[PDB]
């Protein structure tokens, strides 16, 4: 039940505010050494903050590049931590992850993030939101899919048939456009003995923006 | 500040072998480097802390070694469950500086990839756009050339291309290419063709398809 729970991110203006909530139970809260780490797909995992209890020492560290604008806090009654980010820039950007150290004292043997959260992701963008235009790609075997195009922010998720199609379904990562704006391609190779007889419905679902959009494919 | 470089950076080896990983510091972290394994989409797990140190759980086929600035990652025979991405981190002293981290993958036999092409919808060409999608599926190796011919006049700064991720089923790739064009520049044309160009295959794969026909 040792388990972390992140929320609070979504898509923000540049230079806004945001408030990353990290929830905690199964283990008794008010001891626990808790740090912050973001992940982007450029630099990888990257160290934020850290917030310890009850130390007279600093207690609160920061990595160097979040000084100043972002700040940890914790309150013991609430078995929570939180990150409130401020003058938010396009760094920023990434999934956030809350996790427990295995440090009890100030130079405790035995170092690592042994408990992590699913992570809560972050965009910071001008860019306004926008649902997603879907478009047909149709045809031993054959092959068919969707182009979901023109979507902000991420993510869009895609299934087939309602969760039906499992074998051979390829959807691949979202590309960012000139536009600014991402489509996506997913495709699904079905043995060519099942074209039109067996109806292939495309669903796509943007929740950003609200969008749930379903498109045939027939050749 | 304190350094650390991570070495390599993407690596490919086969079920059973044996793989060694490098992680380098700007400084003697002395023994408090810990690694992580990160699995597409999921968190990060600890491996091995202290440097030689293994967790409860994690199998005995991880062992960690070295002292002062070198430090290595050693996985005796790969089994399929190990292909991710792998990060170590130094505790010496905050901040918790982290390692660039080594993407690894898995490497089966070549495989030469099938290819689809797919042309603009008519509801895609009520709105002024057309993309044009060629599909690559279940190859191996991930490098591949993918070419575009409109009129066979090669083609250069309209198409973008994205591969998945390192399939579970067989270890396999997946690419699609899409040739965006304008609707005008679209009904100009006639002859679009996609090349690919593959270890697996030994001649130059080409798939068109005639706007008119
Ligand atoms: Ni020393
Ligand atoms: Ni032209």
């Known amino acids: 039940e040792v388990k972390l729970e992140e929320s609070g991110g979504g898509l923000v203006q540049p230079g806004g505010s945001m408030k990353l909530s990290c929830a905690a139970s199964?283990?008794?809260?008010?001891?626990?050494?808790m740090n912050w780490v973001r992940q982007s797909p450029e630099k990888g995992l990257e160290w934020v903050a850290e917030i310890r209890s009850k130390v007279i020492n600093p207690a609160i560290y920061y990595a160097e590049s979040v000084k100043e604008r972002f700040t940890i806090l914790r309150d013991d009654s609430k078995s929570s931590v939180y990150l409130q980010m401020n003058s938010l820039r396009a760094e920023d950007t990434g999934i956030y992850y809350c996790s427990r150290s295995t440090m009890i004292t100030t130079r405790d043997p035995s170092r690592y993030f042994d408990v992590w959260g699913a992570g809560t992701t972050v965009t910071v963008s001008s860019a306004s939101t926008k649902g997603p235009s879907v478009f047909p790609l149709a045809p031993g075997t054959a092959a068919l899919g969707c182009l979901v195009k023109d979507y902000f922010p991420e993510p869009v998720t895609v299934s087939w048939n309602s969760g039906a199609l499992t074998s051979g379904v390829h959807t691949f990562p979202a590309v960012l456009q000139s536009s600014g704006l991402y489509s996506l391609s997913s495709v699904v190779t079905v043995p060519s003995s099942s074209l039109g007889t067996q109806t292939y419905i495309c669903n796509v679902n943007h929740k950003p923006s609200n969008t749930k959009v379903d498109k045939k494919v027939e050749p | 500040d304190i350094q650390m470089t991570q070495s390599p950076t993407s690596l490919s080896a086969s079920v059973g072998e044996t793989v060694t990983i490098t992680c380098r510091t700007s400084?003697?972290?002395?023994?408090?480097l810990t690694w992580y394994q990160q699995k597409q989409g999921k968190s990060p797990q600890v491996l091995v802390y202290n440097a030689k140190t293994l967790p409860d759980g994690v199998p005995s086929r991880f062992s960690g070694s070295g002292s002062g600035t070198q430090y290595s990652l050693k996985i005796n025979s790969l089994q399929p469950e190990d292909f991710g991405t792998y990060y170590c981190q130094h505790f010496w002293s905050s901040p918790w500086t982290f390692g660039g981290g080594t993407k690894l993958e898995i490497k089966r036999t070549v495989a030469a990839p099938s290819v689809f092409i797919f042309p603009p919808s008519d509801e895609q060409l009520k709105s002024g756009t057309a993309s044009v999608v060629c599909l690559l599926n279940n190859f191996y190796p991930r490098e591949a050339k993918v070419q575009w011919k409109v009129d066979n006049a090669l083609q250069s700064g309209n198409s973008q291309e994205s591969v998945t991720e390192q399939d579970s089923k067989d270890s396999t790739y997946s690419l699609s290419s899409t040739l965006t064009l304008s609707k005008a520049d679209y009904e100009k044309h006639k002859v679009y063709a996609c090349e690919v160009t593959h270890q697996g295959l030994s001649s130059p794969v080409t798939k068109s398809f005639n706007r008119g026909e």
């Open positions: 199964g283990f008794t809260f008010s001891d626990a050494w």
């Open positions: 400084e003697n972290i002395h023994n408090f």
